[model samples]
Target: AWLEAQEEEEVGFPVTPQVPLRPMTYKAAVDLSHFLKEKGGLEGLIHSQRRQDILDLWIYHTQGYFPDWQNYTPGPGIRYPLTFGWCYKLVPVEPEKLEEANKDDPEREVLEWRFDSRLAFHHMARELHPEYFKNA
Candidate 1:
């Protein structure tokens, strides 16, 4: 019945925007060392060796893909100021290459490792109350 009412009203399918599950935060940038130690471990060679690569993947997946200017803004809580001209760049990492690298490493888990690092940083920044910006 409700489906029929929607058709009568000419209502289309509801559009759900795929926003970032975790938005960027200041702590994310600063907690890199801890992320490396905890997720990668003290001598977790795979993480240590590929830290930059993992970061590239995370940034690309998190910041590059989601949240447009009109809908998303940066900052912590409600007190942080918003900026108008913020810019971010993620070094391109070929997914195929990253996959191949992970396949070659017996101990390396690509997606999990990347997310753990990214989320750690994101949470950290939120804790620190960093300014967030909306690109204009």
Candidate 2:
């Protein structure tokens, strides 16, 4: 029923977007955000909890492999969650600068994260998908 309700409210192009063959190299997350915005609209974005559920659906949608447990197994084996990777690109920070920083601060704690899809989604939700913000 939850899924049915989302389907009824979804708004988007006739075709649903597909995960790219090489998801790591592509901006598939951004593409997904665009597609979701198109489908979910303001109503979907505003409901924070529902929005999370929708994203979970997409994670499953982009799963690379089906669990081996689908087959008849003689015994129990390791089982993992259905969704593994989120199919987001991870670009490196400035190589030379990072190297220099690492050398300079061997004992200091320094962290760097590449451009993340989670960040992209938050940005798009606040900027591009402003339907939820119109009244506010």
Candidate 3:
């Protein structure tokens, strides 16, 4: 019932402007690689028959529509969650540069994140249960 209400509300919601946000950590970036590995790698997400099922339930739920599977592509940079369940994108920052910047201005070099849908699913599965894929 709540979901139906939200969907109805979304039908009338306006698209808003995009905003820039901070970058993600190297590990988090690499974690995506690991995540792909666990899920039988990138091809699994891109070409598997089951991909749509997962997308329909997870991605569409958050993004509010099914992405055009043929056209959907990952951003080159990191992504982070932002206001209203939206996310921000982050480019890869050199660790050395981050360290050097932090040396002079600790506050300026604070670590932040961007969302990667694959990474998001990985974490979500881990949080909810490691066996999420089993039933799928």
Candidate 4:
């Protein structure tokens, strides 16, 4: 399928790779990490509830102005940025399930490598909205 799409592009036809986007809420994001670590056989990673707010704020800048900004609540925003912008550039990785051999071991290397990713999100938030984090 990927090769066929490339072939279509080679012939001067525009090929759009349609992929599903998952709408993520902070709740869902936190829940997913927890679920994956606990039951999905992966070691847990540390997460900050406060940082999720900053992350969402940065997502808003990428997503442009919200149409329902007035009606919406404080956190999570009106709609999740599932389409474009920072959603494409910066994305948090989901926890990986353990390997068959690693699953049996009580102590093994875990796949909790998203500190830089989270830092990237923070970088955008701080750069874009300095005032918010000034007091934070």
Residues 1-136 of candidate 1: C-alpha lDDT, one tens digit per residue: 2112334455356544444556544454435435545554432232333554544444455445332321223432212112122222212132434244445545432321212333422334334433442335
How many Å off is the CA of 24 in candidate 2? 4.2
TM-score of each: 0.22, 0.27, 0.18, 0.21
Per-residue error (Å), model 2, residue 63: 5.8
Each prediction's Cα lDDT score? 0.35, 0.34, 0.35, 0.33
Q: Count of backbone clashes for each model?
A: 8, 1, 4, 0
What lDDT would candidate 4 get against the real structure?
Answer: 0.33
**Candidate with more favorable, higher TM-score: 1 or 4:** 1
Q: On TM-score, who's better, 2 or 4? A: 2
User: Model 2 — which ten-residue stretch has the worst lDDT?
Assistant: 75-84
Instruction: For residue 44, give model 3's deviation from the true position in Å.
Output: 6.1
For residues 77-118, could you state the per-residue lDDT of candidate 3 as single tens digits?
Answer: 333322111222243453534344345535332222233445
Model 2 Cα RMSD, 1 decimal? 19.2
Which pairs clash inside model 2?
11-39
Which of candidates 2 and 4 reaches a greater lDDT?
2
Q: Tens-digit lDDT track for model 2 on 1-136?
A: 2334645566344443444434332255355435544553322222223454444554544543222211111222211111212222212232333244444534322222122345543343234234433554
